[PDB]
Design a protein around this ligand. Structure first.
Ligand SMILES: O=C(O)c1ccnc(C(=O)O)c1
Ligand SMILES: [Zn+2]
Length: 441
C-alpha cells in the first residue's frame, strides 16, 4: 500500500536526507519577527481589499475554478502563464520604477513582498552555495536561478471552501492543490515559499502540509512536511523537475507566498511591444488611418505579420480580458499598456485586410498568390479556431456564474454590422475561400 512519512517517523529524516536533499526547510524562527509582522499584515491587507481571486483555469478540455484564490505580484510588465492562463503582475516597487497605479495600502503590500522576495533570494543563494559545496566533495548560474521576478500568492479558507479532493496515493488527506510541478520556470530555478497559517496514524488533518513525491513513483513513500505560521521552504535545483508537490489543507485559513523565476522571454510587456513594432514595420506609417498599405508582400514578412497578430490577440488581449477587469481593482498599471496593444492589434486587423485585398487582385500571377496563401493560411486557421475557443470559454456555464467584478469579457469583440472593423470576427468564410483558391487547376 501507499504510505507517507512525517516527523513522527524515524525513517522520515533519513528518507529526507537520502531522496529529497534539495528540499530545504527554514522554520519561522530563522526569520526576523519584524519581517513576519510586515509580511502577515501585507497578506491580510490584500485579502481585506479583495485582491485575491480564484482563476477560471483550463485543464484537459475543461474549465475549472481553482479552489485556491490568488494574486500574482512582481516585476512590472512581467507575466506568468500557468494552466493556459496568463497572470499579469501587479507591480512591486522594483528600482527605477514608479507606480501611481496602485492604492496606498496595496502599494505598501507589494513593497513588503518585494522585501520578502529579496530576503528569500539571499537565503536561496546561500543554500545553493552550500549545496554545491557538499557536491564535488558558476556563481552566475546560481544568481540567475535564485533571481525571483514574481510571487504567486495563495489563499484558502477550508471552512468556507469545503470542496477538497483527497490525496489518492499515500493517504495524505485533503488537497488544497493537487500533485503538480510548478511550470514555466527557468530551468533548474529554485522556488521559495513563505507559509502563513492563521493559527496517531499519519499526518495531522488540522495542520497544513506540503506533500512531496518522486515523479512517476508511488511505491517510494511520500513526504508530508508540516507547515506552521511563518515556516519557509525552498525547492532547489532540479527538485521541481524530478519531484511533484501538492498542498495539503489543514482546518484553518492559510496564505502562501510562492516566489519563482518565471521564464519570460516571450512573457513581458517590453517583449510584446517589440514584436508589435516588428509587425508594423511592413506598414507605411506616415499617418494613422484606415488606408493601410503594406511595404512588402514577401511570404516570410506576411507570415511573420499574421503570427505576431495572433500572438498579441490571444496570448495578450484575450488572456487579460478573460480575467477582466479585476486587475483594475489592485492597480491600473496595465490599463494604458492594454489600450496600446489593442490599438496595435487593430492596425493588424488592417494589415490582414490589406493582404486579403492583395490576394484578391487582378494583376497578380497565381504563383505569387499561392505563395502568399501558403504563407498566411496556417495563421488565419489558428486565428479562427482560437477565437471559437475563447468565445466559448467566455460563455461557459461556470464563466457566467462568478461576480460581474470578474466576469470574463470576450474582448476584442465586434458584430458583423460593426463598420469600424475591416474584417469580420468570424473568419470561417474567408478561410474557406483561401483554401479553395490554393486548390485550383
Ligand atoms: O501553497 C503552497 O505552499 C504552494 C507550494 C507550491 N506550489 C504552489 C502552487 O500553487 O503552485 C503552492
Ligand atoms: Zn506548486
Amino acid at each position: 500500500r501507499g504510505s507517507h512519512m512525517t516527523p513522527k517517523d524515524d525513517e522520515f529524516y533519513q528518507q529526507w536526507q537520502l531522496k529529497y536533499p534539495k528540499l530545504i526547510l527554514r522554520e519561522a524562527s530563522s526569520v526576523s519577527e519584524e519581517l513576519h509582522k510586515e509580511v502577515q499584515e501585507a497578506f491580510l491587507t490584500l485579502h481585506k481589499h479583495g485582491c485575491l481571486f480564484r482563476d477560471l483555469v483550463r485543464i484537459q478540455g475543461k474549465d475549472l475554478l481553482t479552489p485556491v484564490s490568488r494574486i500574482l505580484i512582481g516585476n512590472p510588465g512581467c507575466t506568468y502563464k500557468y494552466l493556459n492562463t496568463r497572470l499579469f503582475t501587479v507591480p512591486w516597487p522594483v528600482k527605477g520604477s514608479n507606480i501611481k497605479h496602485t492604492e496606498a495600502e496595496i502599494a505598501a503590500a507589494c513593497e513588503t513582498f518585494l522585501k520578502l522576495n529579496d530576503y528569500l533570494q539571499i537565503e536561496t543563494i546561500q543554500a545553493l552555495e552550500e549545496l554545491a559545496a557538499k557536491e564535488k566533495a558558476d556563481e552566475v548560474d546560481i544568481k540567475s536561478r535564485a533571481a525571483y521576478n514574481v510571487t504567486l500568492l495563495n489563499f484558502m479558507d477550508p471552512q468556507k471552501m469545503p470542496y477538497l479532493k483527497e490525496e489518492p496515493y499515500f493517504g495524505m488527506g485533503k488537497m488544497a492543490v493537487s500533485w503538480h510541478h510548478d511550470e514555466n520556470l527557468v530551468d533548474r530555478s529554485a522556488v521559495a515559499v513563505y507559509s502563513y497559517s492563521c493559527e496517531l496514524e499519519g499526518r495531522d488533518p488540522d495542520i497544513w502540509h506540503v506533500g512531496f513525491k518522486i515523479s512517476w513513483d508511488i511505491e517510494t513513500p511520500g513526504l508530508a512536511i508540516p507547515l506552521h505560521q511563518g515556516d519557509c521552504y525552498f525547492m532547489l535545483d532540479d527538485l521541481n523537475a524530478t519531484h511533484q508537490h501538492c498542498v495539503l489543507a489543514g482546518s484553518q485559513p492559510r496564505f502562501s507566498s510562492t516566489h519563482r523565476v518565471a521564464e519570460c522571454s516571450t512573457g513581458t510587456l517590453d517583449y510584446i511591444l517589440q514584436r508589435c513594432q516588428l509587425a508594423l514595420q511592413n506598414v507605411c506609417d506616415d499617418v494613422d488611418n484606415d488606408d493601410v498599405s503594406l511595404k512588402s508582400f514577401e511570404p516570410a514578412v506576411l507570415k511573420q505579420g499574421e503570427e505576431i497578430h495572433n500572438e498579441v490577440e490571444f496570448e495578450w488581449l484575450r488572456q487579460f480580458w478573460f480575467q477582466g477587469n479585476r486587475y483594475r481593482k489592485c492597480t491600473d498599471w496595465w490599463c494604458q499598456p492594454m489600450a496600446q496593444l489593442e490599438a496595435l492589434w487593430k492596425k493588424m486587423e488592417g494589415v490582414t485586410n490589406a493582404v486579403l485585398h492583395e490576394v484578391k487582385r487582378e494583376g497578380l500571377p497565381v504563383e505569387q498568390r499561392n505563395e502568399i496563401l501558403t504563407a498566411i493560411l496556417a495563421s488565419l486557421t489558428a486565428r479562427q479556431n482560437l477565437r471559437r475557443e475563447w468565445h466559448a470559454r467566455c460563455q461557459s456555464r461556470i464563466a457566467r456564474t462568478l461576480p460581474a467584478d470578474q466576469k470574463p469579457e470576450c474582448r476584442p469583440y465586434w458584430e458583423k454590422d460593426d463598420a469600424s472593423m475591416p474584417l469580420p470576427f468570424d473568419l470561417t468564410d474567408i478561410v474557406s475561400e483561401l483554401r479553395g483558391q490554393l486548390l485550383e487547376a
